[model samples]
Target: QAPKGSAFVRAYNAGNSELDVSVGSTSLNDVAPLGSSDFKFLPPGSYTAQVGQQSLPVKLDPDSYYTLVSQPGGKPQLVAEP
Candidate 1:
């Protein structure tokens, strides 16, 4: 469960292998290549996301939705969407 007035998040695997994703203490594991994780609720704040050995900073806003996509040889990227 997420904090009150949280944002919704989803992770997409754009790389060629499986990915393990985490936002703070929450973990979404084994994301298949070219696949995505279901939407997860999270608190609005700054967070460090881990995709494999890559760590990326994420800023989430309340009542918003976002997508994190795995990037090759770099940290995952965030995309704001409806």
Candidate 2:
């Protein structure tokens, strides 16, 4: 999720399965083992995402992209005009 000023991000898998959280060209690896994870915090910029290998580009609203993935289908649906 987005935080003020800081570009660092924390991600976690709430489910029983593993999840690889990534932003732009950065990957947080499978956080399932860690319970939750955080990124080193990159400068606000464009980023791409990959979940287990499925890659997708996400444009940061002010420098990063934010979207909500629908459950079941896992469809990346745009919620704002990023």
Candidate 3:
């Protein structure tokens, strides 16, 4: 389990191909196209995600849930959901 006050994140592969989603050095590999991943716990802060050759920044808030969607030919984008 994650420490208290951490945020939860998931990845969605909206593109036509698979992707590897990474925060810092940790990566969740082989996210299927048009599919989503299980939630991962992370501390609340700004994070850089490595998707393909692109890097995108995401701001996570404590005790919140967020989804990162991979875009074709562009960087990933974040969607904060309730």
Clashes of each: 0, 7, 0
TM-score of each: 0.77, 0.46, 0.76
Question: Worst lDDT window (10 residues) for model 1?
Answer: 38-47
Model 3 residue 15 CA deviation in Å: 1.0
**RMSD each, Å:** 2.9, 5.3, 2.4
lDDT of 3: 0.72
Task: List ranges where model 3 is wrong by over 4 Å.
Answer: 1-3, 74-76
Per-residue CA lDDT of model 3 for 1-82, tens digit only, reads 6677788777777787877778766766667777878656556777886565446786678878888777768657788975
Which pairs of residues collide in candidate 3? none
Candidate 1, 1-82: lDDT as tens digits:
5566678777777788887888777776767877888555545777776765555786767877888877768556788875
Pick the winner on lDDT between candidates 1 and 2.
1
Error of 3 at 77 (Å): 3.4
- Rank by TM-score (best first): 1, 3, 2
lDDT per residue, candidate 2, 1-82, as tens digits?
Answer: 5565434434434444566677676655666632655454446655675544234554444433344232223443433322
Model 1 / residue 57 / CA error / Å: 0.7
